[PDB]
Write an enzyme that holds these catalytic residues in place. Sequence first.
Site, short mmCIF file in Angstrom:
data_model
loop_
_atom_site.label_atom_id
_atom_site.label_comp_id
_atom_site.label_asym_id
_atom_site.label_seq_id
_atom_site.Cartn_x
_atom_site.Cartn_y
_atom_site.Cartn_z
N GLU A 113 7.03 -34.72 39.32
CA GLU A 113 5.57 -35.51 39.48
C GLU A 113 4.74 -35.45 38.66
OE1 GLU A 113 5.98 -33.03 41.85
OE2 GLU A 113 6.76 -34.62 43.11
N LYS A 137 26.75 -25.50 30.93
CA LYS A 137 27.35 -26.78 30.38
C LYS A 137 28.19 -26.48 29.50
CE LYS A 137 23.08 -28.29 27.67
NZ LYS A 137 22.42 -28.34 26.81
N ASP A 177 28.59 -27.55 36.85
CA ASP A 177 27.30 -26.09 37.15
C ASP A 177 26.86 -25.51 36.26
OD1 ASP A 177 25.32 -26.20 39.24
OD2 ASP A 177 26.69 -23.88 39.64
N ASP A 215 25.60 -30.92 36.13
CA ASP A 215 24.35 -30.14 35.76
C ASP A 215 23.54 -30.16 34.41
OD1 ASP A 215 21.85 -30.45 37.50
OD2 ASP A 215 21.99 -28.17 37.08
N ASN A 216 22.24 -29.99 34.47
CA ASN A 216 21.88 -29.02 33.07
C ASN A 216 22.13 -29.63 32.63
OD1 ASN A 216 20.10 -27.03 32.10
ND2 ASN A 216 22.14 -26.26 32.23
#
EC number: 2.1.1.6
Length: 213
Positions: A196, A141, A138, A166-167
């Site tokens: 989107e 990184k 988490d 993640d990330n």
Amino acid sequence: DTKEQRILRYVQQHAKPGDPQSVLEAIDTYCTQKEWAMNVGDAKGQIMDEVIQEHNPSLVLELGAYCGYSAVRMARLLSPGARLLTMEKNPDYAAITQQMLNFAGLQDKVTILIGASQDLIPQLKKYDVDTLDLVFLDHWKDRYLPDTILLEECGLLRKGTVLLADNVIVPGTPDFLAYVRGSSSFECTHYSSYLEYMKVVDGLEKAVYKGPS
Ligand code: NA
């Protein structure tokens, strides 16, 4: 108040006690409104759910925590007898995470380990961990590669242990993506969430260990 304290306050004032989905929605709504993190449920929560549910892990290690969103996301999916260990060096982040899990009613599913990963990974054996089923890396990184090396050295990875990070959108140093992809010991999948539009919002890497030599 810190941002993480303000997230917890928003949850306490708006979410339904004992309802993990309500807590997740509140964190996500508030952070999206403040533009601190955009639509985390869509950008990483759905992928977290996909990976965890395909593997049904009995023992999950979370490396890193901030406000407890990820811990609630994962803990709500764990079966009886399964548990999450959440390791975080910052005691303020660990405290918010604890209170977030308490509010969600998920505290019995989690143990929070407060300390540096260099000190605590070699002590996971004392928590009766032989090997881990899933490791969720988490936010921070730059710790992912050295933490993975420590997990290997401490014998905590078995054949089939899943790492989910993640990330991981842009290259960094230490380069975790290059490490797991280049190594024949890991089978790797990258996930890019666009929401989107056409720019990456979050990126995750799944790396499945092939077992020790
Ligand atoms: Na690889």
